[PDB]
Amino acid sequence: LMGGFGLKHPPPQIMIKNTPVPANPPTNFSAAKFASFITQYSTGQVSVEIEWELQKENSKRWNPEIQYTSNYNKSVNVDFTVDTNGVYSEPRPIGTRYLTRNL
Amino acid sequence: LMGGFGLKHPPPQIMIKNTPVPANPPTNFSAAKFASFITQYSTGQVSVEIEWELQKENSKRWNPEIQYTSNYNKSVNVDFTVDTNGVYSEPRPIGTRYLTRNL
């Protein structure tokens, strides 16, 4: 109901954690669990590749159709772009429904 | 300079006329040319088929591009359509330059 595709078997969850690295144990045995750990974090790179199937528009209508377009008028910032501070923003919620079809 | 493609050998001219059909000649020979003709015209159907080669847009720009679009606001007449009297009109001179490319 928010949108998208309902999948019985959706893309699986990818789970990740940093393996615990203990700090130095005491020199005499203690059966208590370790609360003492070496502070660490991890970084890396993640690639995702999806293949999408398209359904082309077959329409016979004579007149032109509504398209999603940028505005030609001048502006301080270009839409869908970084600003002077390096912040990427999205001006509007673009939807997918423009082309038309008969019932 | 008006636009289009310059061709040394453009599409040829297609020429058509109605063959003259004389009216009844006099019954005695006269060497004067005939000025007297059966009034007639011709109608028919004409098909033209052109094959056009396309050059696809390769652009890497992130932000969206200007498109040619219809206006969604309501109006008495749809653009590029007949009116109530059956007259087809073109509201504006659509040009071909929308997509962008670097120098």
Automatic annotation (TrEMBL), chains A, B:
It is found in: Virion. It comes from the Viruses. Belongs to the parvoviridae capsid protein family. This is Capsid protein. It comes from Adeno-associated virus 13.
